[PDB]
């Protein structure tokens, strides 16, 4: 669903889908080719 985001103070609008890649456990978020957040770790449980 297209919804509004507030993720640990960072805001956006998009659709949450499951990441298939291998990520760092200490990673809060990550950036695309345009340096905007395309992926973010969930704060309560560990999922990106």
């Amino acid at each position: 669903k297209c919804v509004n985001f507030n993720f640990n103070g960072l805001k956006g609008t998009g659709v949450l889908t499951e990441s298939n890649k291998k990520f760092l456990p200490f990673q809060q978020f990550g950036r695309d080719i345009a340096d905007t957040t395309d992926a973010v770790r969930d704060p309560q449980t560990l999922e990106i």
């Binding site: 080719i33 345009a34 340096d35 905007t36």
Partner: protein
């Protein structure tokens, strides 16, 4: 008919090997490839 039929086959052997004869059409794509990657890299700039 011996000279003309061998002359068409030298064009086919040259275009199957040398790729730089079609590179004038490849400069049409590569100037547009830098143009569409221009506006992506401007979004990461802080602009002051």
């Amino acid at each position: 008919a011996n000279q003309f039929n061998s002359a068409i086959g030298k064009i086919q052997d040259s275009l199957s090997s040398t790729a730089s004869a079609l590179g004038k059409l490849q400069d049409v794509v590569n100037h547009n490839a830098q143009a569409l990657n221009t506006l992506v890299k401007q979004l990461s700039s802080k602009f002051g």
